[PDB]
Amino acid sequence: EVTIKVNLIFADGKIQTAEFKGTFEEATAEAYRYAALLAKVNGEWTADLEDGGNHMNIKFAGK
Amino acid sequence: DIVMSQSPSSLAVSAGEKVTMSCKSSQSLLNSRTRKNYLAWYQQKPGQSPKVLIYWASTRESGVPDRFTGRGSGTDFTLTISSVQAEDQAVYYCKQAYIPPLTFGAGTKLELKRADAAPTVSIFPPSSEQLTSGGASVVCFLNNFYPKDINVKWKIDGSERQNGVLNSWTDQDSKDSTYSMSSTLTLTKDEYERHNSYTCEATHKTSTSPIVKSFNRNE
Amino acid sequence: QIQLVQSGPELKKPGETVKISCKASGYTFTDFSMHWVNQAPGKGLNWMGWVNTETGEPTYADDFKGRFAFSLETSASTAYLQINSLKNEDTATYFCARFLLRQYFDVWGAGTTVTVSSAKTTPPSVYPLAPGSAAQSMVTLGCLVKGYFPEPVTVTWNSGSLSSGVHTFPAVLQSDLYTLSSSVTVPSSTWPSETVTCNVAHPASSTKVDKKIVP
**CATH number where C153 lies:** 2.60.40.10
Contacts of B79 (CB under 8 A, 6+ apart): B20, B21, B22, B23, B41, B53, B54, B68, B69, B70, B92, B94
Number of domains in chain A: 1
Let me know whether C106 and C123 are in one domain: no
Contact C182, C142 (CB under 8 A): yes
Which of C36, C57, C129, C174 is most worth mutating to test chain B (most B CB atoms within 10 A of its CB)?
C129
Domain end point (choices B88, B114, B140): B114
Task: Supply the DSSP symbol for B146.
Answer: B
Which of C34, C59, C167, C214 is most worth mutating to test chain B (most B CB atoms within 10 A of its CB)?
C167
Nearest to B182 among C37, C138, C181 (CB): C181
Domain containing residue B134? 115-217
Contacts of B35 (CB under 8 A, 6+ apart): none
Touching A: B residues 125-184, CB under 8 Å: none
Give Rg (Cα) of chain A: 11
Whether B22 and A37 lie within 8 Å, measured CB to CB: yes
Let me know whether B24 and B78 are in one domain: yes
Let me know whether B125 and B204 are in one domain: yes
Let me know whether B122 and B40 are in one domain: no
Whether B124 and C49 lie within 8 Å, measured CB to CB: no
Nearest to B11 among A3, A14, A18 (CB): A18
Contact B155, B202 (CB under 8 A): no
Nearest C-alpha of chain B: how many angstroms from A27?
9
Is B11 within 8 Å of chain A by CB?
Answer: yes
Let me know whether C51 and C85 are in one domain: yes
Upper half-sphere CA count for residue B178 (Cβ side, 13 Å): 18
Let me know whether B189 and B82 are in one domain: no
Domain end point (choices C118, C138, C155): C118
Q: Is the preceding omega at residue C152 within 30 degrees of 0, hence cis?
A: yes
Which of A6, A17, A24, A33 is most worth mutating to test chain B (most B CB atoms within 10 A of its CB)?
A17
CATH, residue B90: 2.60.40.10
Residues in chain B with CB shorter than 8 Å from the CB of C111 are 49
Is B86 within 8 Å of chain A by CB?
Answer: no
CATH, residue A32: 3.10.20.10
Let me know whether C132 and C53 are in one domain: no
Let me know whether C100 and C126 are in one domain: no
Let me know whether B2 and B107 are in one domain: yes
Nearest to C167 among B42, B91, B180 (CB): B180
Domain containing residue C204? 119-214
Residue B35 three-state SS:
coil
Domain end point (choices B83, B99, B114): B114
Which of B25, B103, B124, B130 is most worth mutating to test chain C (most C CB atoms within 10 A of its CB)?
B124
Task: Supply the DSSP symbol for B74.
Answer: T
Q: Subunits with at least 3 CB pairs below 8 A relative to chain A?
A: B
Let me know whether B68 and B167 are in one domain: no
Four-point Cα dihedral C192, C133, B186, C154, nearest 10: 20
Question: How far apart (Å, rounded) are the C-alpha atoms in residues B13 and B19?
Answer: 7
Domain end point (choices C60, C85, C118): C118
Closest CA to C167 of B46, B209, B82: B46
Task: Supply the DSSP symbol for A6.
Answer: E
- Tell me, in Å, the resolution of the deposited structure: 2.1
Distances (CA, A) of C7 to C78, C110, C112, C114, C121: 11, 9, 6, 11, 19
Distances (CA, A) of B200 to B38, B153, B162, B211: 53, 6, 12, 8
Let me know whether B65 and B125 are in one domain: no
Is B51 within 8 Å of chain C by CB?
Answer: yes
Let me know whether B7 and B101 are in one domain: yes
Whether B10 and A30 lie within 8 Å, measured CB to CB: no
Number of domains in chain B: 2
CB atoms within 10 A of CB C89: 9
Let me know whether C98 and C26 are in one domain: yes
Let me know whether B120 and B68 are in one domain: no
Domain end point (choices C118, C148, C179): C118
Number of domains in chain C: 2
Residues in chain A with CB shorter than 8 Å from the CB of B14 are 14, 16
Question: How far apart (Å, rounded) are the C-alpha atoms in residues B79 and B63?
Answer: 17
Whether C181 and B168 lie within 8 Å, measured CB to CB: yes
For this PDB entry, the determination method is X-ray
Let me know whether C85 and C150 are in one domain: no
Let me know whether C138 and C181 are in one domain: yes
Let me know whether C106 and C137 are in one domain: no
Whether C181 and B184 lie within 8 Å, measured CB to CB: yes
Is C38 within 8 Å of chain B by CB?
Answer: no
Q: Which residue of C has its CA nearest to B102?
A: C47
Whether C46 and B40 lie within 8 Å, measured CB to CB: no
Question: How far apart (Å, rounded) are the C-alpha atoms in residues B185 and B125?
Answer: 10
Let me know whether C131 and C192 are in one domain: yes
Q: What is the 3-state secondary structure (H, E, C) of chain C?
A: CCEEEECCCEEECCCCCEEEEEEEECCCHHHCCEEEEEECCCCCCEEEEEECCCCCCEEECHHHCCCEEEEEEHHHCEEEEEECCCCHHHCEEEEEEEECCCCCEEEECCCEEEEECCCCCECCEEEEECCCCCCCCEEEEEEEEEEEECCCCEEEEHHHCECCCEEECCCEECCCCEEEEEEEEEECCCCCCCCCEEEEEEHHHCEEEEEECCC
Q: Subunits with at least 3 CB pairs below 8 A relative to chain B?
A: A, C
Beta pairing, strands C172-173 & A55-60: unpaired
Question: How far apart (Å, rounded) are the C-alpha atoms in residues B21 and B27?
Answer: 19
Domain end point (choices B114, B148, B170): B114
Nearest to B12 among A3, A16, A33 (CB): A16
Contact B192, B103 (CB under 8 A): no
Is B105 within 8 Å of chain C by CB?
Answer: yes
Let me know whether C30 and C44 are in one domain: yes
Contacts of B186 (CB under 8 A, 6+ apart): B135, B136, B137, B138, B164, B165, B166
Edge-first strand order for the sheet with B19-25 is B4-7, B19-25, B76-81, B68-73
Let me know whether B110 and B16 are in one domain: yes
Let me know whether B79 and B22 are in one domain: yes
Touching B: C residues 144-173, CB under 8 Å: 144, 146, 167-172
Residue B122 three-state SS:
strand
Contact C191, C141 (CB under 8 A): yes
Let me know whether C86 and C156 are in one domain: no
Domain containing residue A39? 1-63
Beta pairing, strands B36-37 & B39-44: unpaired
Let me know whether B196 and B211 are in one domain: yes
Contact C122, C205 (CB under 8 A): yes
Size of interface A-B (CB pairs under 8 A): 40
